[PDB]
Structures are given as structure tokens and as C-alpha cells.
Design goal:
The structure is a homotrimer of 331-residue chains. Chain A has 6 helices and 14 strands. The first copy, chain A, is of the alpha+beta class. At the A-B interface, strand 5, strand 7, strand 13, strand 14 and helix 6 of A face strand 2, strand 4, helix 2, strand 8 and strand 9 of B. The structure holds a molecule of 3 linked components (NAG-NAG-BMA) (3 copies), adenosine-5'-triphosphate (3 copies), a molecule of 2 linked components (NAG-NAG) (6 copies), 2-acetamido-2-deoxy-beta-D-glucopyranose (NAG) (9 copies) and magnesium ion (3 copies).
Chain lengths: 331, 331, 331
């Protein structure tokens, strides 16, 4: 029976290690560079803003990032803001009846300005505390619904991924060598029809993750594009191909709805004829697209092979002899 | 005694491996997304700049980043810069007595413009070489002390961290489900009183790292916020909690004081009525806050358990039999 | 012979493990922070743009990044763009003979505006479809050659790298303590003469990677600066030194030339006296410099040493006894 036992061990070393686990290969991780470009135009003709055009230079903030990009889907605008004194937005906290309620220097965390201790009139019927800030102050109580830039559902995104394995002298990109300019000009990614077109539609990205673009566009969120490289360098180089998957990354609270979506504030600065600073305040809601790249390569190397061989041999002998010892003890 | 030896080995496999090392669990790394928001307003009434307001759109450059943010604490401003010809800032190098000293095209690395080979008068008493640049040139010899935006010590920062373990289908955020909006509106992190409030005060961040905010605010630096997730997925999901620690990341030289702090330059561009380009040059000193997230999860899996079991068995037999061989040789 | 065999095993444990592999050391990975600064000025006197000055605030977009930076080398400018109606750039697709060819709402992915269904005259001889966009539309058919900002070859880049090993309480930077301000003011990196000056010239960076800066500057690309830390903490702290290498990261297609270089679009916004929005559209070509830091440290620890010792002992006995068993079977 010893011979039988030793054989099973031989099976383990040959089938599970060298074949199943490819113990004959050396492994390495990937170094990746990602660049993105978005195309699409949105047109709005609201009464307050008039006729507006939104192109790539308008809704992508900033122009370029690393492994990420942000696309604006909803917006609140405050134009003609100047440094001075103004009343606050009326609420349960800022409403005052006299100067006694207001305290000078009450610069809280949520106050967009520094209170001057004076109770001034926001309009004819309400009176609020006066602050020193950019005036008039922003009113963000009514987020637009549906999204202001809901046409972003039909925008397209090109992902250019350059991967490099420093150990094996192997580099390539996700734009395959058999892709032409004519094909790249009019291709949209699909898992079945165009699995290697590197151009994705944003609405399709959100839908493939199991969500709805129009629901997510009102307040924003985080979407994760996962690129996977599983290349065996013993094969041809044309068989090292990427795989794409999508997942929503921001966790949503439905019991309390604490801190939903994703937004930030930025401004565009101007000057008048007199030289005074002026600005437009922009509260931007939108979706951030993170590109996550995983990849490992394998190439045949003699060292790992030999190491495993020795281990298997040792293992076999030890086991067989262990079995022999146990058999005599049982006898 | 063989029985005794085999027993000790049994102890090793049961106590150190399965229990202490949790060999019965499969492990995975974390995928994290970090978003930040800063609140706070600073007011200055200097003579040169007049009355100014600094809000989040003014001192955070750029509006949003990935795993990082920059807050301005000190500033030098050069307003009304136009492209043309101007003298350099007087020093030991730019001061000239005649056009012979100046050489045309002497565009060095530290020259903010290209020298035209002419010696012009900086003012009535000093004469410096003429350059072609944005004029007038910046004078950064006197860094303001104390910091211009020293009120940034009292600003607050919200950190939103979304973590995902791809292997186990587990995702959550650092804003716990038992945190409400009322609590989040007025909470400040403290290791003892509020260990899970995700809002930190910048001065407290710098102080908890063993430093002083006012000293660091004059020239800037790098501060590292470390988030640690140590979650055992066999337990309840509410026990996967983050831990926060802080450390200053920029190494300071005190023997020579070579390249201290952290600063960069950026500009705001304007136009006049005639269409000529005009700009304000801004040299910004401040602190960069890097968010570093570490996390590993563990969940029970049968494979690792069995593997360890086999190893322990093998080990035991081999050892016991090794001891038996050694005993006979000693005899 | 048993004694001989056991001896060879002793050699393995002593020479390959403890000495060659340093099994007596505990290992750790690095946490790195990278900051960059670029110096250099370019002057152009083209007929369309007039006299222009390009300083660090003009060609670095954005002002600061994380582990990366972008330097502009070529540019196409479209000034005085306003929202309205204008014809498209003539080509094989936009040229129309009547309003029947144009379809209203034909907002494609490659259309910079939304077609209004009208065929208007681009100039006296050609007629193209009308779109609603920022007008006039950009004409990017003729990329300037040689590069507009080809003087960027002589710009210099300072890399400040702060590394930290959390396990061993060891931190330092790539600006060595024996580097002075006088040396840092006028040093350029060279592998033989100045191997530790942290200031690199961009043209030299591209040349050391095996390429030409002027060829790469017309359309741009990605360049990778690799920093390597190989520190043995048992030695003196002054011997933990960085090593620099360079590699081009963007893969180029020469058979089809699909998606070459690297570029993006951004705008500068202005207002007129009447309050209408106006902008300058900028298509920027340039090189992105990615800083990649690898580092592992080793310090003596008793645990790893003991573990290896035990393994070696076990190994020796098992092997020697395995050989003894095999010998009797052969007999
Ligand atoms: C360029 O080379 C790539 C190879 O990386 C070609 O990809 C191939 O694309 C076709 C069409 O999408 C795939 O066929 C598919 O087969 C599945 C069944 O396996 C079927 O369900 C689909 O409907 C489709 O017929 C093919 O699998 C894929 N090759 C792979 C994945 O290795 C691509 O077509 C080439 N393009 C050109 C223009 O030559
Ligand atoms: C929401 O759930 C968290 C659980 O993750 C609650 O955290 C708990 O907070 C309290 C109060 O800060 C901690 O009590 C502390 O105990 C230490 C001694 O261990 C003491 O020195 C402190 O002064 C304080 O009393 C408690 O340990 C902590 N739970 C943990 C760490 O598991 C939080 O209170 C909950 N919030 C609400 C509003 O229910
Ligand atoms: C500051 O300390 C560093 C040590 O990290 C000094 O680096 C040393 O620089 C010199 C000059 O570049 C190197 O000498 C070189 O030797 C090779 C042969 O090994 C030769 O081919 C070169 O032409 C050059 O002579 C030296 O190896 C290097 N030390 C190392 C690498 O450990 C640096 O010089 C110090 N600076 C000052 C101002 O003291
Ligand atoms: N840096 C900060 N300091 C203190 N509170 C903050 C900070 N950032 C956000 N908050 C508060 O946390 C809550 C949820 O944050 P969130 O930004 O998602 O909501 P929000 O309505 O967009 O916040 P806000 O409009 O006040 O900027 C808000 O009530 C907000 O006031
Ligand atoms: N890209 C660069 N090329 C050459 N020298 C540089 C570069 N960046 C910085 N330096 C020099 O390195 C030294 C230290 O850098 P650091 O930026 O910290 O000081 P600094 O006074 O803020 O620099 P500067 O004001 O000239 O921009 C300075 O003397 C600076 O001139
Ligand atoms: N987001 C996108 N959606 C669709 N097509 C795209 C997108 N980004 C780029 N492309 C197309 O891919 C091709 C190669 O991209 P690339 O940007 O390198 O060339 P380009 O001439 O600079 O592109 P363009 O000038 O149209 O912005 C171009 O024909 C471009 O139109
Ligand atoms: C995105 O594009 C699709 C297709 O171009 C739009 O879907 C069509 O929209 C038109 C009106 O523009 C409707 O008449 C059609 O019934 C829609 N469906 C189809 C199948 O054609 C879609 O509305 C666009 N999304 C936007 C603009 O947000
Ligand atoms: C890693 O791969 C690159 C790409 O093949 C090699 O670059 C070649 O380098 C030689 C000598 O420097 C040149 O003659 C070739 O023209 C280069 N090829 C290309 C495509 O540019 C590089 O040498 C490889 N590295 C090593 C260590 O062999
Ligand atoms: C940050 O805020 C604290 C508390 O609001 C300030 O500390 C107080 O400042 C006032 C003046 O504004 C003094 O009268 C008090 O004596 C200070 N201490 C206390 C305990 O109240 C602090 O000055 C602020 N830091 C700034 C503005 O840089
Ligand atoms: C990973 O976890 C998510 C979250 O639980 C799973 O998403 C569910 O998917 C099913 C089918 O697609 C839906 O019916 C549920 O509504 C989803 N849940 C939520 C909360 O959105 C996802 O299926 C899991 N992945 C796998 C492979 O099981
Ligand atoms: C980068 O700088 C070098 C040296 O400063 C320039 O090379 C010289 O340029 C001058 C003209 O400015 C020529 O007369 C010399 O013959 C060039 N060579 C040498 C060795 O001096 C180089 O032209 C610059 N590159 C630019 C401006 O793109
Ligand atoms: C890690 O290293 C730092 C730097 O040496 C240590 O910081 C010292 O901390 C003590 C007590 O907090 C201070 O008295 C020293 O002045 C600090 N040194 C410096 C240079 O700032 C830190 O304590 C170390 N960490 C541990 C756990 O020992
Ligand atoms: C925008 O809407 C107004 C109101 O109907 C209309 O008068 C105007 O012509 C529209 N804009 C354009 C560019 O047609
Ligand atoms: C003043 O403003 C508040 C808040 O928007 C509003 O409720 C109130 O009706 C306004 N009063 C008048 C007279 O417009
Ligand atoms: C800047 O200077 C020009 C003249 O050089 C002047 O016309 C303009 O008003 C100035 N701008 C400001 C903001 O003072
Ligand atoms: C700023 O200081 C000046 C000088 O004291 C003062 O006249 C002015 O009123 C101050 N600004 C404001 C908004 O009060
Ligand atoms: C000219 O400027 C230099 C440098 O700031 C200064 O030292 C000198 O006193 C100035 N001369 C006059 C007359 O203002
Ligand atoms: C841009 O054109 C408008 C008229 O369309 C003109 O008033 C303005 O002066 C121009 N701007 C520049 C910078 O030439
Ligand atoms: C730019 O070139 C023109 C044309 O030769 C010249 O008149 C002008 O003086 C040049 N610019 C400068 C600043 O000299
Ligand atoms: C009109 O523009 C097209 C495209 O640039 C050009 O080919 C053509 O010669 C132009 N016609 C006239 C009359 O300028
Ligand atoms: C903003 O308001 C000022 C007066 O406060 C006015 O002079 C200016 O024209 C306004 N700007 C716009 C764009 O309406
Ligand atoms: Mg709000
Ligand atoms: Mg300086
Ligand atoms: Mg084009």
C-alpha cells in the first residue's frame, strides 16, 4: 500500500501544484496608467439662467484627474456675489426679533459668514441675523428635480488603460491592436456585442450596476469601473485581454438618510470696471467615476518549478515513511 | 514521552493556529473611497487687501481631490500683472551697474522672466536687470507672520469613507447607521467622548499629532490621517468599526533648513476693456491632509481550516517519529 | 554519509536563509508622500497670439496634484467664444446642400453642439450644418509643428519624496541631510556626477528613457519616474538612499496610429460689460509625469530568526531520517 500512498502524493504535486496552481510560473503585479475623456453636450433654456450650453469644459471639474473623473448632473447657481454685509437665509436658527438675539462674532461651522450682531430684514416679512460674507448668500434648500443636466445620461466616456509588468518586459493597452479608428469612432461597449470597445455610455454604466441614472443624478454618487487583467505570458500576447465590471461605491442610508449623494462647491471669479472682486458660486452635484485596475501575470520560470519539485519529493517520502511507522504501531 | 511530544504539537495546531492566528478564516484587503468637505470662514481687514472674506471656495485648492485635500493658511498676493517688461527684484544677483553686466536671453531656472540684456531702474536708488515676464514681478522675501489665514485652526473637516471587501460581499461607511443628522450637525471628534464622529477640527488634528497649528501654518506641511478597519465578518456587522490616528508626514530639517513647509503658485485671470490679459498671482502656503486607509477582513472558510488541519497532523507525526529516531540514536 | 547530508542542510539554513535571505529580519512596506515643483519660462511672439509669456502658473494644469503633474508642450487656442448659433467646421460629414440634409436635434457624441436642422454658410464657398454651442467652434485639424512650447525641454522639476515605515519608526526624505541650499540651487541630476540631486531636467528625463523630447512634445505622452528605496535598518540611517529610473508609460500604435499622445480641454471664463459669459477654449497637449515609489525595509527581529531555526532543524532531521529509510530499502 505504501506504493499506493506515494502515488496519491505524486498526483498532488503533478495535478494540483504544477498544473492547477501553475507552480512552474513566476508571478508579478501590474503598474497601470489611466486616462479618460468625456463627450456630450447639454442644452438648457431655463428662465433664470437663459439659454445655456454645457460642453466638456463646463461639466467636468477639474479638467483631468488621476484614476478618476467627475461629471456634473445637478447644479445650484448664485451669481453676482460680492464681499460685504447681507442677511442670512431665514430658518429656525437665523431668524431674530432684535439685535439682542444676534451675537457678534458668532462664526459657527455652518455659518457661511461671520455674524455682526445686527438683526436686519431679509425681506418685508422676515428678519434674520446679519453676516459678513459673499452676498447674497446661497439658497440650496430646493435641489432641482429632475436633474438640471439629466442629458448626461447619454454622454460617452473613453477609458485608456496602459499596463506594465516590470518583471517580464511586457506592456500593452486596453485599446487592442486590431481596433481601428473607424471602429473606435462609433462603438459603444456591450458585454456581448462589443466586449472590447473602450467607450462606455454613462447611463449604461449606472444601469449595468443595478441602478437608475435619473435617480442617482439628482444628488450624485460614486460609481466604480473595475478593469481586470488575467494574462498568461506563456501564451500569445494577443490573449492578454481586459474584463470590465461596474459597482456603485457610495453606501446609501434609507432609515435616516444621513449625508446622501456627493457634492462640492467652487467659484468663478470676475472683476468690474472699478476693480472689485466678483464671483459666481456653484454647488455641483454629480457622479464620480473611479477606475480600479487589478492585474497579475504569469511566466514560466525554472526556479519555482524546481522548488515545488523538491517539496513534493520530500513530502512524498515523509508521508510514505510516516504511514509505514503508523502501520507497525497499529500491528 | 512520545505521547507527551505529540500533545504539545496538538496544542500548537489548536491554540496558535486555529485560535490565535484564526487559520479557519479567509482574508481579503479593502477597497476604499474617500470624500472630504471643509467648513469655516475667515475675515481679514489688512490695509493692502482691504476687507476680505475667505470661504471654502477660496482656501481649498482645488475644489475636490482624491484621498487628499489642501487648505490655505498663508498667502502672498501680486495683483494687476500684465505681460511686458519690468525690472527684477533687487538682490545680490540681479543688481547691475550697466548693460554690460546683463546678458540677453539669460533665462535661468530661478528667473521668472527672460532677461533682455538691459539694466533698468527698479527704483530711485537701485538698478536691476530687465526681464520679460508678467509685471510687476512677485516679491516673496517676507512671508507673513503670524499666518494670514490663522483662523483656519478652527475649521472642521468631514471625512466620508466607503469601504468594500470584494471577496465577501460586504460594504459599509465610516458614518455609522446609529449616527443621526442632529448628532452629525454638532459633533467634534474626540478619542474618548466621540470616537465615531467623522468630523475633525484641523487644529485638534495637528495637536493630536504632537505639533502646533500656528507654527505649522506659517509655511505649511503634510499631515496624515490614518483610518484602520479591523473587521471579523463572523461577528455582527455593527462591530466593524474604524480607528483614527494622526501623524505629520513631511520631514523637517533643523540643521540647514532646506526646503521647508509646502507651497505652490496659481493665478486668477481677467481681461480689461481692450481685451488684454491680466492676472493675480497667488503664492499659497498651507497644510495638505492625506487620508490613508488600511483594512483587512476575515470570514470563516472550510478550505483554510482543512489545510491547517492536515499540516498539523503531518507535523505531529513527523515530529513524534523524528523524536523516536533521535531517542534510539542517543541510546 | 548521514552526517554529510545533515551538513548540507545546515549549509542551506545558514547560508541561503539567514544570510542570503536575511531570515533574521522583519520586513515592512513604505508609505510615501510626493510633492513637485517646476521652474522655467517660455516666450512666444506669434502673429495671432501676439507677445506671450508662459510661466509655471500657465503651463502646469492644475496647480498641484497627487503623485503626478502635467506640463503643457503644445496648444490650440479659441478666443472669444460665446453661447449662440454658428456653423460647424467643414468636413465630409457636416457639409450640407440644403436644410433637408440637416436634422434637428442631431446631437452626436462627436458634435460639439446640438444641430438646429438649418444649413448655413461657413464661408463664401462652403455651407455646413448649424449647431448651438460656444461660437466660433474649435478648429483642431492642424496641430502645431514644432511644438508651441518646445522650450519646455529645458524646464527643471524638483521631486520631494517623504517615506515612512510604520512598523519601525523610521522616516526620511529624498533630500539628504548633507544637501545644502547652495548645492540645491544649482544642481541637475546625473546618474554619475549628481546621483542624489532631486532636480531633474525634463528633456533629460525623456532622453534617459530612450526617446526624444521634441518628437514627444507635439502630441504628448506619459512618462514614469520610478523611485526605489532599499534600506537595511540594521545599518546606519544615512545608507538608506533612493535610486531613480525612467520609463515611457503610454503605448504607441504605429500600424494604425489610434489615439496617440495625451490631451484634454479646459477653458478660462470672462464677462463683458453687459454680463454675458465669454470664454477662451484651450486644447492642451503635453506630458504627464507620474511618480512611482517602491520601498521595503528590513530590521533584525528575534521571532523570524527563531522560526527559521526551527524549520531548519526539523528539515534536517526529516531529511537525514528519510535518507536512512531510503538507504535500507536500496540495500
Ligand atoms: C479584435 O480582437 C478581439 C479579440 O480580443 C475580438 O473579440 C471577439 O469579439 C467577438 C464579437 O464580439 C466575440 O464573439 C462573441 O462570442 C460569444 C460566444 O463566445 C457570443 O456570445 C457573442 O455574441 C460574440 O459572437 C469573441 O468572443 C471575441 N474574442 C474573444 C473574447 O477572445 C474582436 O472581434 C476583434 N475585432 C475585429 C474588428 O476584428
Ligand atoms: C453609536 O454606536 C457606537 C458603537 O460603535 C457607540 O460608540 C460607543 O460610544 C461610547 C461613548 O463614546 C463609548 O463609551 C466609552 O467607553 C470608554 C471605556 O470603554 C470610556 O472611557 C469613554 O469615556 C466612553 O464612555 C463606547 O465604548 C462606544 N462603543 C464602542 C467603542 O464599541 C455610540 O455611542 C453610538 N451612538 C449613539 C448615539 O447611540
Ligand atoms: C552627500 O552624501 C552622498 C551619500 O549618499 C554623497 O553621494 C556620493 O556622491 C559621489 C559623487 O557623485 C559618488 O562618487 C561616485 O563614485 C562612482 C563610483 O562608485 C563614480 O563612478 C562617480 O563618478 C562618483 O565619483 C558616491 O558614490 C556617492 N555615495 C554613495 C552613492 O554612497 C554625496 O557626494 C554627498 N554630498 C556632499 C556635498 O557631501
Ligand atoms: N466640514 C464639515 N463640518 C461640519 N459639518 C459638516 C461638514 N461637512 C458637512 N457637514 C454637515 O454634514 C451634514 C451632511 O453633509 P452633506 O454635505 O452631505 O450635506 P449638505 O446639505 O450637502 O451639507 P451643506 O449643504 O451644509 O454643505 C450636513 O448637515 C452638513 O452641514
Ligand atoms: N523645479 C525647480 N528647479 C530648480 N530649483 C527649484 C525647483 N523647485 C524649487 N527649487 C529651489 O529649491 C529650493 C527649495 O525649494 P522651495 O520651493 O521649498 O523653496 P521656495 O523659496 O518656496 O522656492 P521658490 O520660492 O523659488 O519657488 C528653492 O531655493 C527653490 O528655488
Ligand atoms: N468620450 C468619447 N466618446 C466617443 N469618442 C471619443 C471619446 N473620447 C475620444 N473619442 C474619439 O476617440 C478617437 C481617439 O481619441 P483621441 O482623444 O486620442 O483623439 P482626438 O483627436 O484628440 O479626439 P477629439 O479631438 O475628438 O477630442 C477620436 O476620434 C475621438 O473622437
Ligand atoms: C438619450 O438618448 C435616447 C435616444 O437618443 C433618448 O430616447 C429617445 O428620446 C426621444 C426624444 O429625444 C424620444 O422620442 C424617444 O421615444 C426616446 N426613445 C427611443 C428609443 O428613441 C433619451 O431620451 C435620451 N436621454 C436624455 C435626453 O436624457
Ligand atoms: C524592455 O522592453 C523595451 C521594449 O521592447 C526594450 O526597449 C528596447 O531597447 C533597445 C535598447 O535600449 C532598443 O534598441 C529598442 O528599440 C527598444 N524597443 C522599443 C520597442 O523601444 C527594453 O530594452 C526592455 N528592457 C530590457 C532590460 O531588456
Ligand atoms: C478658535 O476658537 C476658540 C474658541 O472659539 C478661540 O479661543 C477663544 O478666543 C476668544 C477670542 O475670540 C478669547 O477671548 C478666548 O480667551 C479664547 N479661548 C477660549 C477658551 O474661549 C480661538 O482664539 C480661535 N482661534 C483662532 C481664531 O485662531
Ligand atoms: C453583493 O451585495 C449586493 C448588496 O446586497 C447584492 O445586490 C443585490 O442584488 C440582487 C440581485 O441583483 C438584488 O435583488 C438586490 O436588491 C441587491 N441588493 C441591494 C442592497 O441592492 C449583490 O447581488 C451581491 N453580489 C452577489 C454576487 O451576490
Ligand atoms: C535648451 O538650452 C540649451 C542650452 O542652453 C540650448 O542649446 C543651445 O541653444 C543656443 C541658442 O539658444 C545655440 O546657439 C547652441 O548651439 C545650443 N547648444 C549649446 C550646446 O549651447 C537649447 O536650444 C535649448 N532648447 C530649447 C530652447 O528648446
Ligand atoms: C516614532 O518616532 C517619532 C520621532 O522620533 C517619535 O516622536 C517623539 O515622541 C516623543 C513623545 O511623544 C517626543 O518627546 C519626541 O520629541 C518626539 N520626537 C520627535 C523627533 O518629534 C514617536 O514617539 C515614535 N513613536 C513611538 C511609538 O515610539
Ligand atoms: C430660449 O427660450 C426663449 C423663450 O421661449 C426663446 O425666446 C429663445 O429663443 C430660446 N433660445 C434660443 C437660442 O432659441
Ligand atoms: C421672505 O422670505 C421667506 C423665506 O423665503 C418667505 O417664507 C416669506 O414669504 C418672504 N416674505 C415676503 C414678503 O416675500
Ligand atoms: C490695473 O492697471 C491698469 C493700468 O495698468 C488699470 O487700467 C486697471 O484698472 C488696474 N486694475 C485694478 C483692478 O486696479
Ligand atoms: C475694515 O477696516 C477699515 C479701517 O478701520 C474700516 O473703515 C472698515 O469699515 C472695515 N471693514 C468693514 C467691513 O467694516
Ligand atoms: C529700492 O528698493 C530696494 C529693495 O526693496 C530698497 O532696499 C531700497 O531702499 C529702495 N530705494 C528707494 C529709494 O526706495
Ligand atoms: C469679443 O467680441 C465681442 C463682440 O462679439 C467684443 O465686444 C469684445 O471686445 C471681444 N473681446 C476681445 C477680447 O477681443
Ligand atoms: C513681438 O514681435 C513684433 C513683430 O516683430 C515686435 O514688433 C514686438 O516688439 C515683439 N514683442 C516685443 C515684446 O518686443
Ligand atoms: C471655406 O473654408 C474651407 C475650410 O477651411 C476652405 O476649404 C475654403 O477654401 C474656404 N472658402 C473660402 C472662400 O475662403
Ligand atoms: C452685478 O451687480 C452690479 C451692481 O451690484 C452690476 O454693476 C453688475 O453689472 C452686475 N453683474 C451682472 C453680470 O449682472
Ligand atoms: Mg445646505
Ligand atoms: Mg522665493
Ligand atoms: Mg479633433
Amino acid at each position: 500500500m505504501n506504493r499506493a500512498v506515494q502515488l496519491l502524493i505524486l498526483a498532488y504535486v503533478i495535478g494540483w501544484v504544477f498544473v492547477w496552481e501553475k507552480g512552474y510560473q513566476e508571478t508579478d503585479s501590474v503598474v497601470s496608467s489611466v486616462t479618460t475623456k468625456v463627450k456630450g453636450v447639454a442644452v438648457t433654456n431655463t428662465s433664470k439662467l437663459g439659454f445655456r450650453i454645457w460642453d466638456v469644459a463646463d461639466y467636468v471639474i477639474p479638467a483631468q484627474e488621476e484614476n478618476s473623473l467627475f461629471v456634473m448632473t445637478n447644479v445650484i447657481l448664485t451669481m453676482n456675489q460680492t464681499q460685504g454685509l447681507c442677511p442670512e437665509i431665514p430658518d429656525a436658527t437665523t431668524v431674530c426679533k432684535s439685535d439682542a438675539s444676534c451675537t457678534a462674532g458668532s462664526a459657527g461651522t455652518h455659518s457661511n459668514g461671520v455674524s455682526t450682531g445686527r438683526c436686519v430684514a431679509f425681506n418685508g416679512s422676515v428678519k434674520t441675523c446679519e453676516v459678513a460674507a459673499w452676498c447674497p448668500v446661497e439658497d440650496d434648500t430646493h435641489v432641482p428635480q429632475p436633474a438640471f443636466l439629466k442629458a448626461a445620461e447619454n454622454f460617452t466616456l473613453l477609458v485608456k488603460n496602459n499596463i506594465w509588468y516590470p518583471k517580464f518586459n511586457f506592456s500593452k493597452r486596453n485599446i487592442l491592436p486590431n481596433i481601428t479608428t473607424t471602429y473606435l469612432k462609433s462603438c459603444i461597449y456591450d458585454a456581448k456585442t462589443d466586449p472590447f470597445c473602450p467607450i462606455f455610455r454613462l447611463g449604461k454604466i449606472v444601469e449595468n450596476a443595478g441602478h437608475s441614472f435619473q435617480d442617482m443624478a439628482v444628488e450624485g454618487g460614486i460609481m466604480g469601473i473595475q478593469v481586470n487583467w488575467d494574462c498568461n505570458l506563456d501564451r500569445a500576447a494577443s490573449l492578454c485581454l481586459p474584463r470590465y465590471s461596474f459597482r456603485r461605491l457610495d453606501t446609501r442610508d434609507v432609515e435616516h438618510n444621513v449625508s446622501p449623494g456627493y457634492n462640492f462647491r467652487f467659484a468663478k471669479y470676475y472683476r468690474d470696471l472699478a476693480g472689485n472682486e466678483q464671483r459666481t458660486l456653484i454647488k455641483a452635484y454629480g457622479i464620480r467615476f473611479d477606475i480600479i485596475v487589478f492585474g497579475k501575470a504569469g511566466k514560466f520560470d525554472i526556479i519555482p518549478t524546481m522548488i515545488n519539485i523538491g517539496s513534493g519529493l520530500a513530502l512524498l517520502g515523509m508521508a510514505t515513511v510516516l504511514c509505514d511507522i503508523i502501520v507497525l504501531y497499529c500491528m
